[PDB]
Protein backbone atom coordinates (compact mmCIF):
# COMPACT_ATOMS: atom_id res chain seq x y z
CA UNK A 1 0.00 0.00 0.00
CA UNK A 2 2.63 2.51 -1.14
CA UNK A 3 0.27 5.47 -1.41
CA UNK A 4 3.00 7.63 0.01
CA UNK A 5 4.52 7.52 -3.47
CA UNK A 6 3.71 9.95 -6.25
CA UNK A 7 0.14 9.87 -4.89
CA UNK A 8 -3.19 10.00 -6.75
CA UNK A 9 -1.93 9.52 -10.31
CA UNK A 10 1.18 7.37 -10.52
CA UNK A 11 2.66 6.16 -13.73
CA UNK A 12 3.34 2.55 -14.47
CA UNK A 13 4.40 0.82 -17.66
CA UNK A 14 2.36 -1.95 -19.02
CA UNK A 15 3.38 -5.12 -20.66
CA UNK A 16 1.90 -6.80 -23.38
CA UNK A 17 -1.89 -6.83 -23.46
CA UNK A 18 -4.19 -5.39 -20.92
CA UNK A 19 -7.36 -6.51 -22.70
CA UNK A 20 -9.72 -6.16 -19.69
CA UNK A 21 -12.49 -4.00 -20.73
CA UNK A 22 -15.92 -4.98 -19.66
CA UNK A 23 -17.61 -1.70 -18.82
CA UNK A 24 -15.03 0.99 -19.35
CA UNK A 25 -11.47 -0.04 -18.65
CA UNK A 26 -8.24 0.70 -20.34
CA UNK A 27 -6.45 -1.40 -22.86
CA UNK A 28 -2.76 -1.46 -22.78
CA UNK A 29 -1.89 -2.91 -26.16
CA UNK A 30 1.79 -3.93 -26.13
CA UNK A 31 3.54 -1.59 -23.77
CA UNK A 32 1.75 1.44 -22.64
CA UNK A 33 2.46 3.83 -19.87
CA UNK A 34 -0.21 4.39 -17.37
CA UNK A 35 -0.55 6.74 -14.57
CA UNK A 36 -3.13 5.24 -12.53
CA UNK A 37 -3.64 5.43 -8.91
CA UNK A 38 -0.55 3.63 -8.18
CA UNK A 39 -0.21 1.36 -5.21
CA UNK A 40 -3.56 2.39 -3.86
CA UNK A 41 -4.79 -1.00 -4.91
CA UNK A 42 -1.80 -2.49 -3.20
CA UNK A 43 -0.39 -4.70 -5.89
CA UNK A 44 -3.08 -3.30 -8.09
CA UNK A 45 -3.48 -0.03 -9.81
CA UNK A 46 -6.19 2.00 -11.36
CA UNK A 47 -5.60 4.50 -13.99
CA UNK A 48 -5.67 5.97 -17.36
CA UNK A 49 -4.04 5.08 -20.57
CA UNK A 50 -3.91 7.62 -23.35
CA UNK A 51 -7.09 8.96 -21.93
CA UNK A 52 -8.64 5.57 -21.56
CA UNK A 53 -9.23 5.02 -17.90
CA UNK A 54 -9.41 1.74 -16.06
CA UNK A 55 -7.63 -0.32 -13.45
CA UNK A 56 -5.49 -3.38 -13.54
CA UNK A 57 -4.09 -5.96 -11.21
CA UNK A 58 -0.71 -4.93 -12.57
CA UNK A 59 -1.02 -8.13 -14.46
CA UNK A 60 0.23 -7.06 -17.81
CA UNK A 61 1.48 -3.86 -16.24
CA UNK A 62 4.52 -3.65 -14.08
CA UNK A 63 6.41 -0.60 -12.93
CA UNK A 64 5.55 2.01 -10.49
CA UNK A 65 4.95 2.44 -6.81
CA UNK A 66 6.57 5.41 -5.04
CA UNK A 67 9.99 6.18 -6.45
CA UNK A 68 13.21 7.72 -5.24
CA UNK A 69 14.63 4.23 -4.86
CA UNK A 70 11.65 3.42 -2.75
CA UNK A 71 10.04 1.36 -5.45
CA UNK A 72 10.21 -1.40 -3.04
CA UNK A 73 13.92 -0.89 -2.73
CA UNK A 74 14.33 0.90 0.59
CA UNK A 75 11.20 0.67 2.73
From Swiss-Prot:
Phosphoserine PTM sites in chain numbering: 65, 68
Annotated compartments: Cytoplasm; Cytoplasm, Cytoskeleton; Cytoplasmic vesicle membrane; Synapse, Synaptosome
Post-translational modification remark: Monoubiquitinated by CBL and CBLB after EGF stimulation; probably on its C-terminus.
Tissue distribution: Ubiquitously expressed. Also expressed in some cancer cell lines.
Domain SH3: 7-66
Recorded superkingdom: Eukaryota
Pathological condition linked to this protein in its record: Immunodeficiency 61: An X-linked recessive primary immunologic disorder characterized by recurrent infections due to impaired antibody production. Affected individuals have normal numbers of circulating B and T cells, but B cells have an intrinsic defect in antibody production. Disease severity is variable and onset is in early childhood.
Function per UniProt: Adapter protein involved in regulating diverse signal transduction pathways. Involved in the regulation of endocytosis and lysosomal degradation of ligand-induced receptor tyrosine kinases, including EGFR and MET/hepatocyte growth factor receptor, through an association with CBL and endophilins. The association with CBL, and thus the receptor internalization, may be inhibited by an interaction with PDCD6IP and/or SPRY2. Involved in regulation of ligand-dependent endocytosis of the IgE receptor. Attenuates phosphatidylinositol 3-kinase activity by interaction with its regulatory subunit.
Assembly and oligomerization: Can self-associate and form homotetramers. Interacts with CD2, F-actin capping protein, PIK3R3, GRB2, EGFR, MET, BLNK, MAP3K4, PDCD6IP, SPRY2, ARHGAP17, ARHGAP27, MAGI2, CRK, BCAR1, SOS1, ASAP1, ARAP3, HIP1R, SYNJ2, INPP5D and STAP1. Interacts with E3 ubiquitin-protein ligases CBL and CBLB, but does not interact with CBLC. Two molecules of SH3KBP1 seem to bind through their respective SH3 1 domain to one molecule of CBLB. The interaction with CBL or CBLB and EGFR is increased upon EGF stimulation. The interaction with CBL is attenuated by PDCD6IP. Interacts (via SH3 domains) with ARAP1. (Microbial infection) Interacts (via SH3 domains) with Chikungunya virus non-structural protein 3 (via C-terminus); this interaction plays a role in initiation of viral replication.
Protein name as catalogued: SH3 domain-containing kinase-binding protein 1
Source species: Homo sapiens (Human)
Protein encoded by which gene: SH3KBP1
Interval of the full protein contained in this chain: 92 to 166 of 665
Amino acid sequence: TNKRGERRRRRCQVAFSYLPQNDDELELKVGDIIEVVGEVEEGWWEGVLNGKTGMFPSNFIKELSGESDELGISQ
